């Protein structure tokens, strides 16, 4: 009976349907039919107090997540079966200001039929609440593309040992809604498809864009596939997150205005649920795209790939725009100037750790002509890039053009309104998050929690960012438009800078356009300038981006709107940085030693110490420049408070410590980190061991910066550090450089030399194997490498961690974690063509590990390896299909579409050969140049060592550029065969055919083009 | 019998010399922060029917590269003190091929194909300058592409068997000189023979009449000519090579060839008679035995090797030790270096031949404590 049910519509707000039975007077259990007219991609979130019991009774457990509904046949089924590919069925427990309860969340998939989910709430048994989710049909049969990997012809659940991939390809036109459904135990790959996809190809039409294209293509880094990742990894660590770290993540679909609806980095339990993903194409799509998402089980290593290429395949109807001129603005690097070292850097470098703080300016305020529309043609627009690569403990200042006396309007703090009356704590799988309610009709969203786990901001935060940039009535425009340098775009994600780059201090700089010459609060829309300081300890390599464009019209029209892209790459430099974190006491990274409310920090020469304190909540407002200079006998070490510190001396740190540089500018609203560079030398003439330089924090915690006398006496034994002479061994027949410097960095023995350097001069096709220990040994508990990512980065100019592919394109780098003895093997092979003389170094250091044996303390040593790579003028007679490897190979073609190409090369004895393809291409056969497609036995699989037992072979699937390289060299073989490999894609097919003939060689040009660099 | 135009197969990427200077290429002349050095491209060669490609972006989509002069392989530069746009025909190049393939949408593919017919060394320049572009007060980089075509030092054989006369060379043989329907050819060392014929067999010029195959790996089948490169070092005067009915038989004039080398060989059945023959295992295995090979010639046409057994380190003479390994052509700085590979029973014999004149001094070493150092002076 309709009159017997208290019918109420669901609260619809920000495409979120809410049925709040918890704190809403309309939905009260004092009588409840919560009917939700669920449209496409609408989040159904149900709130409840703690109960009485549900009819799909769900107990709170980690392994209990099978959310049940009731179908049309009145059978208690799973929601993954009643809704054809539901996504996001989660059970959470939420507390609002003390009052506890639970909630059920899911989303709505596109379905071609009519279905209804019934959630029945019961009591200890009457019927209490009936959440009737009415999901009507929203897609036709021809407007719904799908590849189920649970049944049909693409089922992996009955996959054999021989075949393991049921590849699917269904094409998408404009206005289509599509998705991917995975079976049980098979996680969606990568995390939150289709906002994370494995891209292969994307061709952009200019007429599709209704705004300016704010996408970062990285280094044209289309992503890999899981079939090509797991062949080169470790053994035990083969979970989903490591394979996702090794395969590359792209988020082009959110920039392309696809309606992507998923769960972010908080997915479901894949071992008990069908992980499902969806995306909606825009209605003005006339472009060509290609990507893939996977259903992957990382126990049996079974994958299903849904390679989706779009409907259009013609590359003549794509209106490639001629209005875009791409320009370059390289950033400027200057030596460190502190209003008196500006003259000192000028005087000393003219005659020629303060050298590791190099200042950077990317000046788009001055170079506005690269984002100004040229009067030679009004229709031409300009696009500019600015690639910045900097290390830790650096300072970088960004300049972008601005309107004078610009007022940033405060609608964004008006839309923030962050109070305590909206506080809801939501916990699932014993993991907590904090969320707020929109104060209009008591509405919140779990999509905001998924966005917070993905973008780092809230839902209303993202909406107000988009509306602030869309309603831009000013001339100069920014991306991200609010709070620039406190929000940055890293891997197409607007997130806070100091949250990601943990420990960043906003520096001060002179504001241009003002004659005061005073360093003040600088913000990029307001003053046209913003300075930041890089933290000393960086965990991983990161890269964030900015845009500051200028349009001649007052609107972002894109037919005259210019753009300036700032591309800052921050390298991970790993040392040990001392300090006292106050946030790990109460995931959050801590970069401090934390020698545990009284905090003792020993002053060491040539290091940086740091306090994570709130900016004005600590009792000295200039604490690192002030000092509570008091003796240790004055302070009771056990029974003390922060009030006695009120009765202490307040001498400055520039008087006692000679040139200790205290960096703390706490006047900003969001400064949480303070630092101090301790100088090169200490003196007992001004410092007593009892006399410490103390501070306090929040009137409860205290920090004592005392200096120990034995710690000062341990510095005073250093008198000899010479250079080693080619002690890295070289097996010259096998051409393998074996380096064993484990005993020199071992702190268990007495070592004469603290720092030694080993010089290696290599050539092409030479191997370098270095054995280095890890942090799970004896006498190696504080071992660190330099740089931290040796598989990708080296040390340019002895301190800067740079990518190896920008100086040696095509190096073969492999790190093997030997857990039988907990050591690591570094294996690096030079590609057969080396285009330039390359120098770098790799350092190992165990100087912070201690050996206190027989009342004698001995520390470790420093061992760095010099690497010189010579001029590899020998060209590779292979067939390139990448375009950028025209220096390596002879036949070079840009990867144009519809390029079904054949390349024919006949090789012989003692001659290099190989190929390069793009890494996302379908390699045929799997692992080319190992099991070749032999042509003399009519193009079938045959192992190369079966056909030729004296060959040499290497193959790297993906470097940092994103390409696949393979090389083969035959040495003293006299058979006759012929072998081919096919790089097959969804738009073009390439074939390389190499003929093995011993007495026939290619007629040589008998020299090489000598590339030389002069200065 | 077939025409020799497609007799040299259809293997692409035979260009070799490629002074790439493009934006997408890694030898870019753009202003950048990671590099602030100009790029060179210096070529010395006996240029036999190869080609040189310059991949240079065009003046469209902003004026990028100042190509000096603007028609580089139509008009080319002399020395920098008298830089005028001299024509491509004024130098002395005989039967060249110039291709200004700009039909690709990204670059001006300028290709030059040079025949070895010249009485003198021909040196020419094409500058690629980008100093007009100033980005963040850092200017662009320059390139000074410099090709120095060298004359073939050995004599060249060119006979007549076609209807059309060419007369770029003094004629040696013809069909009236075809004595007794059999051509007996006596090459000296490494020469090339040009039979102007349009119909030769598909598997000819690859075998021998008496014994084995007197051949090298640089047989060039031109569209109107037929040229094979003779090998620099041969075993004995018992092999020949013949193709065809006009029968032409080619055999080497094998004299007693002398090769410099330490040659610590244990087998007395060695066909290679080197200069030195000091043994390695006769002395004790504790002395630092060093072998010195000093080369000082004005015109190098030399052939240096070794015959010591065991293991040869490094892969000589592909990579050689620094005076720490480096390539032989990177230290010699002269192209056209021949190498011979020998697979004997016990002793390992390796040899290389250098023809030309080196600019600088290189003293490279190969270790067989047996050390063999080969020094060649600048002179």
UniProtKB/Swiss-Prot annotation, chain A:
Residues of the 6-Cys domain: 15-138, 143-313, 358-573, 576-720, 724-872, 875-1006
Tell me the compartments it is located in. Answer: Cell surface; Cell membrane
- What practical purpose does this protein serve? Promising transmission-blocking vaccine candidate: targeting the protein would prevents transmission of the parasite decreasing the malaria burden. The LMIV230-01 transmission-blocking antibody against the 6-Cys domain 1 also binds to the heterologous P.falciparum Malian isolate 20-2217-0 which carries a 'Ser-605' polymorphism and to the heterologous St Lucia strain which carries 'Ser-605' and 'Asn-661' polymorphisms.
- Cysteines joined through disulfide linkages: 19-34, 147-168, 182-295, 193-293, 362-386, 400-548, 580-599, 613-697, 623-695, 879-903, 917-983, 928-981
Give me the glycosylation sites of this protein.
122, 138, 251, 290, 367, 376, 414, 496, 521, 560, 845, 904, 909, 959, 986, 989
PTM description:
May be processed into a 310 kDa form as the parasite emerges from the host erythrocytes.
Function, please?
Gametocyte surface protein required for male/female gamete fusion. Also required for male gamete exflagellation and interaction with host erythrocytes.
- Assembly and interaction partners: Heterodimer; heterodimerizes with PF45/48.
* Protein name in UniProt: Gametocyte surface protein P230
Source lineage: Eukaryota, Sar, Alveolata, Apicomplexa, Aconoidasida
Curated annotation (Swiss-Prot), chain B:
Give the main localization category: other
Q: Residues bearing covalent lipid (GPI-anchor amidated aspartate)?
A: 377
6-Cys domain span? 15-152, 258-377
- What use has been found for this protein in biotech? Promising transmission-blocking vaccine candidate: targeting the protein would prevent transmission of the parasite decreasing the malaria burden. However, efforts to produce full length recombinant protein in a functional conformation is difficult. Different approaches have been tested to produce a recombinant protein with display of its transmission-blocking epitopes.
Q: Does the keyword Cytoplasm apply?
A: no
GO cellular component, as recorded: cell surface; plasma membrane; side of membrane
Topology relative to the membrane, per the entry? Answer: Lipid-anchor; GPI-anchor
**A Pfam family per the record:** s48_45
Query: Glycosylation positions?
Result: 20, 101, 160, 174, 224, 263, 267
Q: Does the keyword Glycoprotein apply?
A: yes
Q: Which InterPro entries does this entry report, sorted A to Z?
A: 6_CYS_dom, 6_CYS_dom_sf
Q: How would you summarize the oligomeric state and partners of this protein?
A: Heterodimer; heterodimerizes with PF230.
Please give the function described in this protein's UniProt entry: Gametocyte surface protein required for male fertility.
Q: What is this protein called?
A: Gametocyte surface protein P45/48
């Amino acid at each position: 009976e309709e009159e017997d049910f208290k019918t109420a519509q669901g609260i619809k707000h920000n495409n979120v349907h809410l049925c709040n039975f918890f704190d809403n007077p309309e939905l009260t259990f004092d009588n409840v039919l919560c009917k939700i007219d669920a449209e496409l991609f609408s989040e159904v979130i149900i709130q409840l107090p703690i109960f009485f019991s549900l009819k799909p009774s769900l107990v709170f457990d980690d392994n209990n997540n099978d959310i049940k509904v009731i179908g049309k046949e009145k059978n208690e089924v799973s929601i993954s079966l009643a809704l054809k590919g539901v996504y996001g069925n989660r059970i959470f427990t939420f507390d609002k200001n003390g009052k506890k309860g639970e909630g059920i969340s899911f989303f709505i998939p596109p379905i071609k039929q009519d279905t209804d989910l019934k959630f029945i709430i019961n009591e200890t048994i009457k019927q209490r609440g009936l959440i009737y989710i009415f999901v009507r049909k929203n897609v036709s049969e021809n407007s719904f593309k799908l590849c189920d990997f649970t049944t049909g012809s693409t089922s992996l659940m009955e996959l054999n040992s021989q075949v393991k991939e049921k590849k699917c390809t269904v094409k998408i036109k404009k206005g289509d809604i599509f998705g991917l459904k995975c079976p049980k135990g098979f996680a969606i790959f990568p995390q939150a498809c289709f906002s994370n996809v494995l891209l292969e190809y994307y061709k952009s039409d200019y007429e599709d864009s209704e705004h300016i294209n704010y996408y970062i293509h990285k280094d044209k880094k289309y992503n890999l596939k899981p079939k090509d990742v797991i062949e080169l990894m470790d053994e035990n660590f083969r979970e989903l997150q490591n394979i996702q770290q090794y395969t590359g993540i792209s988020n082009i679909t959110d920039v392309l205005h696809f309606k992507n609806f998923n769960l972010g980095n908080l997915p479901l339990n894949f071992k008990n649920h069908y992980s499902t993903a969806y995306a909606k194409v825009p209605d003005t799509f006339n472009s060509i795209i290609n990507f893939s998402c996977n259903c992957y089980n990382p126990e049996k290593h079974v994958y299903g790939t849904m390679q989706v290429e779009s409907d259009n395949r013609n590359f003549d109807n794509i209106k490639k725009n001629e209005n875009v001129i791409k320009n370059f603005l390289l950033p400027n690097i200057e030596k460190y100037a502190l209003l008196l070292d500006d003259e000192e850097r000028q005087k000393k470098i003219k005659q020629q750790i303060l050298y590791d703080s190099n200042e950077h300016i990317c000046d788009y305020e001055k170079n506005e002509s690269l984002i100004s529309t040229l009067p030679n043609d009004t229709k031409k627009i300009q696009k500019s890039i600015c690639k910045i690569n900097a290390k830790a403990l650096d300072v970088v200042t960004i300049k972008c053009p601005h309107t004078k006396n610009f007022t940033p309007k405060d609608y964004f703090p008006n839309s923030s309104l962050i109070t305590n009356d909206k506080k809801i704590v939501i916990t699932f799988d014993k993991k907590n998050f904090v969320t707020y309610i929109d104060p209009t009709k008591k509405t919140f969203s779990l999509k905001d929690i998924y966005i917070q786990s993905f973008y780092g901001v809230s839902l209303d935060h993202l909406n107000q960012i988009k509306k602030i940039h869309e309603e831009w009535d000013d001339v100069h425009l920014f991306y991200p438009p609010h709070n620039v340098l406190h929000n940055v775009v890293l891997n197409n994600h607007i997130v806070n800078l100091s949250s990601a780059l943990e420990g960043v201090l906003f520096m001060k700089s002179k504001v241009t356009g003002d004659e005061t010459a005073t360093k003040k609060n600088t913000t990029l829309p307001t003053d046209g300038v913003s300075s930041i300081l890089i933290p000393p300890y960086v965990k991983e390599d990161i890269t964030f981006h900015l845009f500051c464009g200028k349009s001649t019209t007052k609107k972002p029209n894109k037919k005259n709107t210019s753009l300036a892209l700032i591309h800052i790459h921050i390298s991970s430099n790993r040392n040990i940085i001392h300090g006292c974190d106050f946030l790990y006491l109460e995931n959050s990274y801590s970069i401090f030693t934390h020698n545990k409310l009284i905090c003792d920090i020993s002053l060491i020469p040539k290091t940086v110490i740091g306090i994570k304190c709130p900016n004005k909540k600590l009792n000295p407002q200039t604490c690192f420049d002030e000092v509570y200079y008091v003796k240790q006998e004055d302070v009771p070490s056990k029974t003390i408070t922060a009030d006695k510190y009120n009765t202490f001396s307040k001498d400055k740190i520039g008087n006692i410590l000679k040139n200790a540089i205290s960096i703390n500018n706490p006047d900003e609203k969001d400064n949480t980190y303070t630092y101090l560079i301790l100088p090169e030398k200490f003196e007992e003439e001004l410092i007593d061991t009892k006399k410490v330089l103390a501070c306090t924090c929040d009137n409860k915690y205290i920090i004592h910066m005392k200096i120990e006398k034995s710690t000062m006496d341990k510095i005073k034994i250093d008198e000899k550090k010479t250079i080693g002479k080619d002690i890295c061994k070289y097996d010259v027949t096998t051409k393998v450089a074996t380096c064993e410097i484990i005993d020199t960095i071992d702190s268990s023995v007495l070592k004469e030399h603290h720092t030694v350097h080993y010089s290696i001069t290599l050539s092409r096709w030479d191997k370098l194997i270095i054995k280095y220990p890890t942090n799970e040994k004896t006498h190696f508990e504080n071992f660190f490498v330099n740089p931290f990512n040796l598989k990708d980065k080296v040390l340019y100019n002895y301190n800067k961690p740079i990518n190896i592919e920008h100086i040696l394109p095509g190096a073969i780098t492999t790190d093997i974690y030997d857990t039988r003895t907990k050591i690591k093997q570094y294996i690096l092979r030079i590609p057969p063509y080396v285009h330039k003389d390359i120098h770098f170094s790799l350092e190992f250091n165990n100087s912070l590990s201690l050996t206190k044996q027989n009342q004698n303390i001995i520390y470790g040593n420093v061992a760095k390896i010099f690497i010189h790579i010579n001029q590899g003028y020998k060209e590779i007679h292979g067939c390139d299909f990448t375009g950028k490897y025209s220096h390596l190979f002879t036949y070079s073609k840009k990867p144009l579409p519809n390029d079904d190409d054949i390349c024919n090369v006949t090789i012989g004895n003692n001659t290099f050969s190989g190929f390069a393809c793009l890494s996302h291409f379908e390699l045929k056969p799997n692992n080319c140049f190992s099991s070749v497609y032999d042509y003399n036995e009519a193009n079938k699989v045959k192992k190369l060592f079966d056909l030729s037992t004296k060959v040499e072979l290497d193959h790297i699937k993906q470097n940092t550029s994103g390409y696949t390289l393979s090389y083969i060299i035959f040495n003293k073989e006299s058979t006759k065969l012929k072998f081919s490999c096919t790089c097959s894609s969804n738009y073009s097919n390439y074939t390389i055919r190499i003929t093995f003939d011993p007495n026939y060689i290619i007629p040589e040009p008998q020299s090489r083009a000598i590339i030389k660099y002069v200065d | 019998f077939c025409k020799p135009s497609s007799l040299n197969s259809e293997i692409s990427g035979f260009i070799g010399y490629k002074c790439n200077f493009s934006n997408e290429g890694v030898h870019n002349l753009k202003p950048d922060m990671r590099e602030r050095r100009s790029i060179f491209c210096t070529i010395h060669s006996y240029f036999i029917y190869d080609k040189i490609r310059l991949i240079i972006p065009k003046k469209s989509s902003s004026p990028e590269f100042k190509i000096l002069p603007e028609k580089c392989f139509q008009k080319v530069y002399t020395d920098y003190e008298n830089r005028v746009e001299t024509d491509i025909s004024e130098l002395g190049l005989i039967e060249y091929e110039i291709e200004e393939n700009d039909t690709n949408p990204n670059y001006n593919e300028r290709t030059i194909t040079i025949s070895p017919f010249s009485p003198k060394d021909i040196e020419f320049f094409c500058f690629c300058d980008n100093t007009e572009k100033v980005i963040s007060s850092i200017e662009g980089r320059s390139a000074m592409v410099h090709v120095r075509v060298l004359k073939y030092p050995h004599n060249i054989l060119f006979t007549n068997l076609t209807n059309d006369l060419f007369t770029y060379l003094p004629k040696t043989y013809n069909e009236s000189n075809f004595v007794s329907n059999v051509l007996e050819v006596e090459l000296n060392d490494g020469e090339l023979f040009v039979l102007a014929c349009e119909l030769i067999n598909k598997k000819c010029f690859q075998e021998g009449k008496e014994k084995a195959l007197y051949k090298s790996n640089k047989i060039i089948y031109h569209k109107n000519l037929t040229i094979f490169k003779a090998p620099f070092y041969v075993t004995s005067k018992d092999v020949n090579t013949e193709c065809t009915n006009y029968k032409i038989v080619l055999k080497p004039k094998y004299e007693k060839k002398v090769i410099h080398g330490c040659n610590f060989s244990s087998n007395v059945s060695s066909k290679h008679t080197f200069t030195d023959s000091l043994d390695i295992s006769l002395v004790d295995d504790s002395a630092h035995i060093s072998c010195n090979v000093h080369l000082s010639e004005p015109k190098y046409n030399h052939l240096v090797g070794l015959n010591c057994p065991g293991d040869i380190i490094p892969d000589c003479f592909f990579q050689v030790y620094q005076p720490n390994i480096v390539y032989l052509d990177s230290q010699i700085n002269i192209g056209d270096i021949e190498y011979y590979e020998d697979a004997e029973g016990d002793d390992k014999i390796k040899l290389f031949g250098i023809v030309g004149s080196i600019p600088k001094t290189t003293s490279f070493t190969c270790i067989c404590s047996a050390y063999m150092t080969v020094t060649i002076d600048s002179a």
